[model samples]
Structure formats: C-alpha cells, structure tokens
Target: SIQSLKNKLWDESENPLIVVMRKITNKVGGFFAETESSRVYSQFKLMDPTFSNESFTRHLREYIVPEILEAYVKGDVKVLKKWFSEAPFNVYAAQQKIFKEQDVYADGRILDIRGVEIVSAKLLAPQDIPVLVVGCRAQEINLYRKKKTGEIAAGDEANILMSSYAMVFTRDPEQIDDDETEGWKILEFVRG
Candidate 1:
C-alpha cells in the first residue's frame, strides 16, 4: 500500500529551512502559516468520505513541483502531460499564443520558478483513485521581463510574484516496467 507516503502532510516544519524562508519572504512578500487556516483541514473532511492524513507533500516537493515548473517555463503542454494523465487539468497553453495574445511577444520574458512549498495538503479521490490536493505558495516564481536592452528589468532580479495553486497529485496507469512503489503523477491543478 501507500504506507511509505503517509504522515507527509502532517509534517511540522520547525527546521531552519522553514525559519529562514519565512523571515526572507516577510520582508517583501510572504506565505501562509503552518496552522494558518482551519479551512484547509475542515474543507477536506467535509468533502471526502475517507479523509485521512496519508499525505504526499514529499512526493509533490521532490517530483511534481519541479517538473511542472519546468514545463511551464518551456510553455509546452506535452511536458505537463508527462506527469498528468487527465485532460483539462494540464492546461499548458502554447507560448506563442500567450506571447502574441498578451502582447509581450517581443518583450522577451521567461517564467522562472525559484521555490515552492505546500501551505496545506489533503488526501482526496477522483474517478475512484486516491490523490493529494497540495495548496502551495509560489512566491518565488515570476516572469523575468527586462528592458529592451536586457537590463535588471525593474526592482528585483528575481521579480517576485504572488501566485498560489491547488495541484491534484496521483499516479497514471501502470507502464510495463512501472514499479508498484513508484506511481507519482499530477491529475489536475487549479490556480488562485
């Protein structure tokens, strides 16, 4: 079973990593707290009939988070599909389309995902399959747009952006060489 993936969401982040980031973000922008919202917990129990603490924040952290960000940077839906088996959820629009429509085609900017963390998590199911709802802070991600001369752009080099999301994490259908212990994919995502 998924016993190895349990107790991830219930993790108490009291380490130095958490402390440093919290301090840094508070100066410019910030994130939600560990026990910030009661809605994060109650929303799951009230929605799911089998809500448990079998978390997978680690899986999200190690695997899906980084991969999806790179996919967004590349602006390719196929990259997103590598981790997602479902449709509409992998709504990675074409870069060309976005560039032209947003009128930044010549602005020459790129999406950069510096860091991410799950402020809240929940175990849920869709189409009779177990999945995790990871609500994350993408404060470190933003568009790196520069002047015509390709300077530092404006304020910060990183260009801090305040975006958040609910990513649905799950496993795709088994491959021929797939390991029973190695099923980690994103089913969907919702931005807020």
Candidate 2:
C-alpha cells in the first residue's frame, strides 16, 4: 500500500497524463523563478525549516520524485493514500483505473524521472489554502510499453517521463511560524 502520487488533473478536459506532460514540453510560462530568492521559497522554508535551496533539490531527487513514482508506475494505492489530499483522491482513483485498463497483460509499464530542477516557486492567496506552483526542468523522461505487441498503447514507448509537481499544503498562516514543526494535510497536488 503506497500512495505517493496523485491525479495530475482529472477535472481538466484532456487525458490526465497527456495534459500534465504539456507544461514541460510546451512551456508557455512558469518555467523560471522571478528571482532565486523568491518569497515562495521563503515561505516554504517555514514549513521545511531544515531545507536550503540545495536541500529542497535533494528532497525532490532523493525522496519526493522516487517514492511517489515508484508507487504510481507500479499501480499501488495504500502508499499513495498517504500522499493524496481531498480533491486528489478522486482524481487519483480515476488515473489508476486508466492505468489498469492500459496495464497490457499485467506487465505494468515504465516511468522514470531524470534531471529535475526547481525552476520556479510562488505562493497564492487562501491563507488556509496555500498554493505552491512549482516549475521544474527535467533532463528527460522515458516511458515504455507494458506488453510488446503490434500496436502502440498510450504510455508504451514513452518510458522517459519528467514530472513537475505543485504540492499544496493546508495550514493556518498564523500557525506557519518558526516553531511550526509540521503541517498536517495536503490541500492539493498539481502534477504536470
């Protein structure tokens, strides 16, 4: 039971996986931080006090990306359950259903993330609904087919996958102080 990855955007019009990958390949905007010392980084520091710019990068590389993805591509729910928030639960389930339909003889599939960079960071309103829109630069991503056949399925032949995530936390701003050791709930996880 692993619940590390959530829905990319179930409510959106396009297929969740297809749409989420657009942010990196298309890149209209949100690819770069206004300045390295963005206030959003400052606020994030409050939640994760021990993290410096370097540490945040390490978190993505060392933990966030791998843990969640291992659960996702493998199609596990329990572990991912710990990761999803209110809205993501429904979306996550939908994506999983799609994955199952596309499992291709129970072979599952491939998803690998490489060269992740924190390109941008910003905050939004909703003192209780803090939004963290993050932009990332990925070296590349690979996607492979679950079962090799005459036909090419959706995720097959695409093992190289670079994912960018916006992790939103729900906590009172007033409570997000130097001494605030932990934040309880995940408000949303916008993945693309």
Candidate 3:
C-alpha cells in the first residue's frame, strides 16, 4: 500500500531537491514534520492510518518544497497550483513574476526547517473548519543572482533569515485512508 506508493515516488528523484532539503534539515537539526511526540500526530493518525513522520517529511522535502522552488525558479504558476490554493498560489506567482522582471533567481544554496507544530486542529469539531495549522520556523538563504549578468542581486551568502510561519493545510473531514499528502493543500501561509 503506502510503502508501495512510497517506492513509486522514490523512483523519481532530483538531487537538487535533496541538496536543499539537507541544507534545511542541517539547520533545523532534524526533520520532524509529524512525529509521535507532536501534538497533532495522534489526531492526524486517527484521521489517516497511513500518517507518519517518515511519509510526511519525505513528501514535503522531496515533492512539496521542491515543486514550490521549481515553480519560482522557472516563473511558472502551474508547478505550484497543485500544492497551493488560490491565495497562496497567487501571492507566490506574483512574487515569481516580480523576480523575473528583476532578472534574478535563487542561488539554491541553503534553507532550514527549524521545527514544526500543530498550533490548531479542527478535525474533531463539527462546528469548526477542517484545517491543520502547521506552525514552523523556516530559514532560507535568500540569496539570488541576476539572470542575464549572473550578478548578486540581493541577500547575503552567510545570512539566513529564519522566520516563523503558519501554514494552513486544508482537508475534508469525511475523507479517510487517502494518500498521506493528498488534499493537503497549503491554503494559507503567514510569516510571523
């Protein structure tokens, strides 16, 4: 089942994504997207039998973040549309467009995922919205270069900006036994 799905996903690999994921994990010290000790882990496990830190982190590092970065690098909105909802997608798409206009792109050197927590969960409440607020400390190199001249446009190589973020992954309360990441779209992302 999920193991087979994992195997299938593993067949498609990208080293650049792995490189970025490692750099981020090194800063965070470890990757624990939905560990047993995490507050939401139990509830998430209750919601989906296939839930696991291994599965979640694998998809996040290998698929989600990579797709997001790839979209931004290529200035393509389609790459992000699958994982992001309207608002966040629009914001990121606009950011990429602005970056393109400025003729700059990421250096792809560093990133960090300090930690993550489930700050809010409404899975058991019928009156509440069905959503998961996965709060995290995210750090990125922020380094960029001019596309044409290959010149440094902004950010410092050594200066990584670690910021607090709240990512809202929307879900349907009625669904179960689906892919661990299926329907988990980041509808909202707030940097705090």
Candidate 4:
C-alpha cells in the first residue's frame, strides 16, 4: 500500500541515514497547519466512492510527498511522472525538458526540513478521490560562491515556510504493476 511505501521512505531501519550537511535556521509559522487543513477540505471535495482515509494519508505522505520533494530539490522534471495520473509520461517529460531549457539555474540543496505535520484529510469526489494537506518548515542554508573563481564564499541561513495540498487518486495508470508501482498513484500538489 502507499502507506507501506511511505514507511519505507521515512523508515530509518530500511533506508535509514539522511545526510544533513548543516543547520540552517529555525522559524515557527502556521504554514503546515493551513496546508493540512486545505488538503482535508480538498479531499472532501474530490473523494472517490471507495475512498479510504488510512490509505489516502499513507500514500500522500510517503510516495507523493517524497517524490515531489525530490523532484523539486533536484530540478528533475522527470519525477513528475511518478505522481501524474492523467497525463502521459512523454508529455510530462517534454514539458520538463522545456522547463529545464528555459531555466538553467534551477537547482538547490535542501539543508534540512525543520518539521512537517498533517493538518487535514477528506474525500473529494466519488471517482476523483481524497486530498491531504500538510504544513512544513524547512531550515535552509542558501549557498553562494564567486562565479569567476568558483569558490564558496558566502552562505545564508533562512527559514522556508510552505504549505501543501495534494489530491490523491488510485494507482497510476501509466505504470506497470510492480513492487514499486504496486500501490503508487497520482498526487496533484500545490505549495506556497
């Protein structure tokens, strides 16, 4: 199930050991809380006929969140295929390619995720499914260096506040049923 997938990702015992480079900053805000609340409301609006809260939350946190986060940090547009339910991978790939071509310097390192919390969960529509909202704070160290010398000279610590709402759907239609794709699905996400 998606929950199992998330457990695998967050599980320290299995894939334990997230390398933390440095401590950035700590700030408190209601970003995560609002995100969670919005997700719950969206899920209620799009819940499928056979919606299950337990399943939705599990997949939302595990497969969906991690996939999106990885994609965002690495600037890998290909990662979008892991969560897009309706669109074809080729289309998404093409879009990503265009995006990369347009934006050359779209890359950054995630210094740390200060905290994350789920605020709400709800069903959306009979066929569409539920949504999960989340609030998160990230303590990040922005790196800057002299372009001419290619030397690290300055780094700034800051708190990044973001809230996310994800729409959960059934298993992805484009993927072959495998161990990895067994319980995977689309999670349409918006963050601010």
Candidate 5:
C-alpha cells in the first residue's frame, strides 16, 4: 500500500512544470558500490528498520532534487514541506519572507543538469542521525531582482555558470512511519 501511495504521488502530471531545467545527464558512481556508502547504508538500516536504497534513490531524484531548485526560485518554501523538515524549512521561509517585504524575486533558469549522485553519508553517533550528502552539477543562470525598483540584486542572466551543489539530508528516524513512504529531508544546501 505504501509503495502504491508513493507511486500515485510521484506521478509527474501532479507537479508543476520545471520549464527551464533539463533531464539529469547521469547518475555517477554506483549507489552502494563504494565502501563508505555501504557503511552508511548499514548504519541507516540499524537506525531505521524500513530503510531501503531503492526507495531513497527514487524519492531523492524524482522529488527532492528538482523540487528544491524550483521552490527556491518561486519563493514558496511551503511547496517543499513534503521534502524539507521543520528546522530547515523555517530558516528558508524566513529568507523568503524578507525578499517579499523588499519586493525581490529570484529569476532562475537552468541550462543543464549535468549529473547527480551521493557524495557522502555520515551517521552521527551520539544522536543516531544519518546524514546524506547529495551532490549535483549544473549550468544555471540564476538572478535576483528588486521588482519594485527594477534593479538586479544578484547573479547575471547573461552568464550561465557551472556549479556544484551539496544538499545534506537527515531526519529523526523515530518520526517515520513504517509505511509513511517519505522520510529523510534536507538539512542544508551548500553551493560551490
């Protein structure tokens, strides 16, 4: 039933169009082939009985990855509630609020999404927290504007930059239901 529910929700037609973004070019490095990944997977299994690589990989690529990019530029953090937990969402929401008061908006466009794969994973011992660092490379032309004043505040539309992103995801295993279908959420977003 949970898998069925997940399939239903993952239906592409349910989501908005990510017009500017193209398909991910590659999924580099086998998910569990690396030594560190195997360790992380075992640790996560110990922490959460329902942990599975199949589900995590599908959910991450199908939902979390693209939604984060889409939500940031749209300035609506609520759209990401299903993927981002309380703390990070609150922090991002505050930033979006400030932009609203100043009449600022992000005009973001993606040229190409080169690839995405797990960069690293860590299990914080004392807290029994499992953190996954998802890495992605893309060419994006993102810019910000003060709409009221008609001024560009950040980035340049004329320049499409190739950049790397590390999105860290973690969750309280206790909060997950055996059949919840969704868990593990973004904790941090690092761009380089």
Candidate 6:
C-alpha cells in the first residue's frame, strides 16, 4: 500500500508541495495548523501555504520527523528516496565520495535544521515545468566527550546548506539536463 501510494505521488507531479503534503499526511502523519507565531513558524508558512506557521512546524516535529525515523530504522529506501531533487542528489553524491575518502569517525548523526524557508515556486520555460525551491541550514555533529575527560564539548558542526527543488512530469525523465530540472531524483541522502 505504501509502495503504491509512493508511486502514485511520484507519478502525479513534480511540485514538492503536492508530493510533500501527500507523503507527510498519508505515510508520515497528518498535518495540523496552529495560531502561534514565530520566526520558524513564519518561515514554514511562507514555504507551505497549506498550513499556518505554527501548524506546519507542529506537523514536521510531531508527524514528519517521526515517520522519517520509522522509515529510516526500517531501512525503507523507497520512502527515503522520495525526498530529494536532482541537484541535491549531485551534492549528496559528492559528499558521499568525500566521506569515503576521509574516513571520518563519528557515532550518531544529527540533522540540526536551524531554519527552513521556501525560496521560490515557479514553472520553467519551454516545458512549463513547476519547481519548488526550499532552503535550509543543516549541520552534521561530530565527536563527543573523551572516555576519560568528562567535559561535554561539541566537536565540529558541518554547515550543510540545502536547496531542494521539485518538478512535475507525466513520466520519469531519463536525465535531468540542467540544475533546474525537478521531480524526485535525490535517492541516496542519509539522515540521522
């Protein structure tokens, strides 16, 4: 059922809004709206008009994240693969290569999203394809206190900037010719 829903959502559109909302609601959990206002909430509202600032965030924390975690723990590659755009995939691949080369040591992972906002949503020329751009700051935490030393000092915070764009297509395109091409393409992104 989940697999079928995933395929339907992907086949339906490239607009991140439709796909994201459907994924968050159907597979992850339902969305909610709230009355409170803050910078984070405001940012979310700007990115997603379907819900107020507070409500969107509440859904992200309560529903979305939990569902993502569930999928991650289960090694649900199908669900994990749906959250990326073509451009992000390139970046993700490069990062993976560098990580393999460096062979860095780390225990658990962290996705510190200080803020998230939608940059723009538009249709490109020629094809009239719809694309949604969302920007956010992600940090990868490294290191912990030494076994002997009790000082709880944070290691390095890899400043990860992300711009995710989605595009709609009647069928899966073989190749994304430019950075602007959209839809679900980033399939190897890892979250902790």
Among these predictions, the greatest TM-score belongs to 5
Kindly indicate the candidate among 3 and 4 with the higher TM-score.
Answer: 3
Please tell me which predicted candidate would have the highest lDDT against the true structure: 5
Candidate 3 on 40-131: residue-level lDDT in tens?
A: 55656766677776776666555665445445434456656766777678878777778788778655432556555454443322233345
Query: lDDT for every model?
Result: 0.45, 0.47, 0.54, 0.42, 0.59, 0.39
lDDT of 1 by residue, 41-122 (tens): 4544454434444344554556567567556543455666666655433344444456546433222223433345544332
Compared with the true structure, what per-residue lDDT tens digits does model 4 show for residues 1-192?
998965654453321111000000011111222234456444443433343555545654555565565565544665765555554345556555764454332344554443344444433343434334344443333333333454443334423433332223344333435555444554433332
Candidate 5 displacement at residue 89 in angstroms: 2.8
Which regions of candidate 2 deviate over 4 angstroms? 1-37, 97-112, 128-130, 134-192
Candidate 2 lDDT: 0.47
What's the CA RMSD of model 6 in angstroms? 16.7
TM-score of 4: 0.43
Candidate 6 lDDT over 76-181, as tens digits, reads 4344445444543455545545644544322334355444453333333324333322333334333433333434334455333232322221112343233332
Worst 10 residues of 3 by lDDT: 15-24
How far off is model 1, as Cα RMSD? 13.4
Distance (Å) between predicted and true CA of 160, model 6?
A: 12
In candidate 3, how many Å is residue 181 off?
A: 4.2
Candidate 4 lowest-lDDT run of ten: 16-25
> Of 1 and 2, which scores higher on TM-score?
2
What TM-score, computed on C-alpha atoms, does each candidate reach?
A: 0.45, 0.51, 0.54, 0.43, 0.61, 0.33
User: How many residue pairs clash in each candidate at the backbone level?
Assistant: 0, 19, 1, 20, 0, 3
Residue-level lDDT of model 2, residues 1-192, one tens digit each, is 123333334334243233433332233322323333456656656766775768756766676555555655554676566655656666778766775576542223334456555543433332323333333334344333445563444544545545554443333445445332224334344555
For model 4 the local lDDT of residue 172 reads 32
lDDT of 3 at 65: 52
Give the lDDT of residue 20 in candidate 5. Answer: 7
Q: Write the per-residue lDDT of candidate 5 for residues 1-192, one digit (tens) a residue.
A: 898865644543222121001011112222222345677788778767667877676666676676676665555555666666665577677777787787777667665565566656655443445567676666777777776667676544447667666566766556676343345666545455
Q: Which clashing pairs does model 6 show?
A: 14-167, 14-168, 167-183
For model 4, state the Cα shift of residue 90 in Å. Answer: 9.5
